Design a protein around this nucleic acid. Structure first.
Length: 122
DNA sequence: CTAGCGACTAATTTTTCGGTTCACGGTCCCACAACTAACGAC
């Protein structure tokens, strides 16, 4: 900005507006309605996992019991539906990896990924 | 629970080869066609 190679941002109107973790409250699992309930600044909200009884199902419960950390999230609205962009802080996964073993990856427009690993081609 | 704060395409021309025309001093073997000399009938 001192030299000048960037214009001042002109924010759009459909922006997902941000809300901090200091606003999530009354998080519980109401079994009667089969949906998590919470308040986004004094308004009830039934969460629609739908047919997602495993993927993010044990993620909100990982927060109702205080086991996963959440960051300043955002919220989108796309014409009747409402979406929450929750920045959950997930951890790394440890496998049985060998640093000496090297995978040779190449990316081209004819073959998006071509990978060598010893005698294994993918 | 909320608020303050850290140049490419089409049209026209021209030319070599083919077509056409004129038209006087060995062997051995198995069949097939003659064929003829003799034989029998009228």
């Amino acid at each position: 900005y001192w030299k000048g190679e960037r214009s001042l941002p002109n924010f759009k109107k459909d922006m997902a507006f941000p809300f901090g973790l200091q606003g999530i409250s009354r998080l519980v699992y109401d079994e009667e309605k089969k949906a998590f309930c919470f308040r986004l600044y004094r308004v009830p909200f039934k969460t629609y996992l739908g047919k997602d009884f495993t993927d993010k199902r044990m993620l909100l419960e990982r927060l109702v019991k205080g086991d996963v950390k959440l960051c300043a999230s955002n919220i989108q609205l796309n014409g009747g539906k409402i979406f929450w962009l929750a920045v959950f802080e997930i951890e790394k996964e440890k496998h049985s990896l060998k640093p000496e073993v090297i995978a040779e990856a190449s990316l081209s427009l004819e073959y998006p990924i071509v990978v060598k690993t010893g005698k294994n081609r993918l």
